[PDB]
Design a protein around this ligand. Sequence first.
Ligand code: MG
Ligand code: MG
Ligand code: MG
Ligand code: MG
Ligand code: MG
Ligand code: MG
Ligand code: MG
Ligand code: MG
Ligand code: MG
Ligand code: MG
Ligand code: MG
Ligand code: MG
Ligand code: MG
Lengths: 137, 208, 107, 76
Amino acid sequence: TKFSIYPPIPGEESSLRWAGKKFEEIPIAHIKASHNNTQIQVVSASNEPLAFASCGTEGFRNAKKGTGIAAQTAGIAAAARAKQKGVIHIRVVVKGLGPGRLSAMHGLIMGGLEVISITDNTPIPHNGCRPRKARKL
Amino acid sequence: SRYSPEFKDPLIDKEYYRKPVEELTEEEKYVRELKKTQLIKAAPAGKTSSVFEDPVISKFTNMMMIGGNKVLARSLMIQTLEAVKRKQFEKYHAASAEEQATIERNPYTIFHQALKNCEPMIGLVPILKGGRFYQVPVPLPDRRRRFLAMKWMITECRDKKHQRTLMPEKLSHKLLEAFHNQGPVIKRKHDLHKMAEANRALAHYRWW
Amino acid sequence: ATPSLRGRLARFGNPRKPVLKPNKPLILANRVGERRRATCITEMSVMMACWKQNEFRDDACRKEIQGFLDCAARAQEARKMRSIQETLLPNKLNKLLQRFPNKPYLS
Amino acid sequence: LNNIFEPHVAVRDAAKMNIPTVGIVDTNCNPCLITYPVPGNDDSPLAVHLYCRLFQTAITRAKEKRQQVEALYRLQ
RNA sequence: GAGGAGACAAGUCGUAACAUGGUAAGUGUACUGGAAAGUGCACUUGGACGAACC
RNA sequence: AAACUCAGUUGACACAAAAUAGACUACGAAAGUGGCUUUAACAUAUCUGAACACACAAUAGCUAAGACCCAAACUGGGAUUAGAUACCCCACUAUGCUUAGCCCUAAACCUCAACAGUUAAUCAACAAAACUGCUCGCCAGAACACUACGAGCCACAGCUUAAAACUCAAA
Ligand SMILES: [Mg+2]
Ligand SMILES: [Mg+2]
Ligand SMILES: [Mg+2]
Ligand SMILES: [Mg+2]
Ligand SMILES: [Mg+2]
Ligand SMILES: [Mg+2]
Ligand SMILES: [Mg+2]
Ligand SMILES: [Mg+2]
Ligand SMILES: [Mg+2]
Ligand SMILES: [Mg+2]
Ligand SMILES: [Mg+2]
Ligand SMILES: [Mg+2]
Ligand SMILES: [Mg+2]
């Protein structure tokens, strides 16, 4: 076989495994990188919450939350919690272009957890709601 | 500068000038041949080929100077070195043979090691992004690190807290403290490092 | 394949309303715009975390401090080599365009 | 044409100064102001050599004929 | 009687416009405000986005 | 700062708005039209032709009834400020939506009228090269003036048409 960047298809017979598990069963680390806060939540393959960590819960307040350093800190905390909950390999789904988008992943990894996949689930309306008006400064 | 651009700084090293001709690479032989036909400045009055010459101590004496009193500055430096050596000899003799193995008596080594200990690894520099300057932690060049160590040492000595204490004793005591990784200079270095770590969040404000 | 310009601008003999309203004329100029203008923070963060957990005693953080210093030296070397290498250039490109300039008029 | 594919300013200046101009014009040249255009290829080495040879030979013939005729008139 | 315009003409409070006029400007319309004017929706360039890749 | 104890995952769920396609330039008279399917449907074998009628006319706005995710004049609060009736942040309303009427205004601008034709001897400047024939509408210093009066209108702080007096040598 050869390496493919696409994920394995559920219901298809694939050879890839992680910790003796199939891709579908790997726990999911939902990152949410808002403009001024980066939240992280590691749920099991059955949406069972395992760990939580946010810039605010890490002690950062006000603008300091929206910093890659704060994202790294929150990711490290979440990774430690998940590691003590028994999580090795994770699938990462991040929804938001906030400053913590990548530093959160870096913190999560530095906390020990390995990442098998990165998923972007940023909400992109197909012209649904009307966002707030522009800013003139 | 009375020296025209053509003039080059002299090199003072008997070993370099006595190096065998066979040991010289093509480029080194070319460098020597080029210098054979180059203008050289006059040897500055501050350095010589003396085997006992120490550039670090020369620079420290220069930094300690006040108003071109090289004589007084050098006198203070030699007094400091003598005081350090005397203190070390006293400790050595009064100490047991076991710890005499560790007790060091070379004042030059003590001075070098104290300065190296005091050298601050990471500094705080103002960096401006978007029109607002912030004290970003930043790596420092070796020149700046050595200069900061020397300046902190000298300023700590010059402080008025030590009253009626002669500069030789002040500097010898502070140098010994630094060598044993204690004292106000080391405290200041740790304070700078602590401030840098506290402001670690602003590292990305750097662009270089 | 450059986007078509047939019937895109408000011109006589163009029944449809304009598609494009270029602020500046769409004529190639004889010049190109001038080239437009932190490093090694992982090692710094490692060293600073070691300092924080060890009370900044450099004695027990020697490997991290040395890595930080060497990384800074390599950053300086990278800056120097990049600068010398940077020194196709806009100047050369403008010279070539001058050699073969645009002709938006009739000779 | 000059080296930027524009008419040589000498054409305009010579027209200003009333100096007659013979000239090889390629299909992208402007023979409006050339007194004696010679529509032809001026970009090929063979063509340029041919033109140089022709003009050189004609000028030499004219000068030598002038010398011969001057001698003929002054020897009678 | 009071309003409106113009002119004359030095003041009072701001700086709305002309530069990216320091919130780009403006048209229509609605509400609001000493005051220029502010904001909401759509429209215009009678503004720009620096015009190879970065 | 104020504001909320609502926040994250998963699932269920609109009378709101219609990513990518679109680097396409099509449809319509203009305003406008870019999710999908279906029905009906896009006038004139000659061109011009409304202050002289008919039918349309974005956004805003009124009337009456519903929906209300989000956005949002006004309003309130938090900032900023010498002040802040603004710019910045938060909440919320009319309103944007559907239905039935009204309203009939836009920088409704491609500021370039319709039809037919030419690229030849150019052409104040800039802009989107210059013209020919024919027709309709419009214009005749600036400002007073998208004004007052008169008139018409489902319009009642409105819209269309629209002057004059005083003033200036400019605009
Ligand atoms: Mg040619
Ligand atoms: Mg202004
Ligand atoms: Mg403004
Ligand atoms: Mg406006
Ligand atoms: Mg308001
Ligand atoms: Mg008709
Ligand atoms: Mg009409
Ligand atoms: Mg309407
Ligand atoms: Mg509402
Ligand atoms: Mg329009
Ligand atoms: Mg009006
Ligand atoms: Mg009126
Ligand atoms: Mg009336």
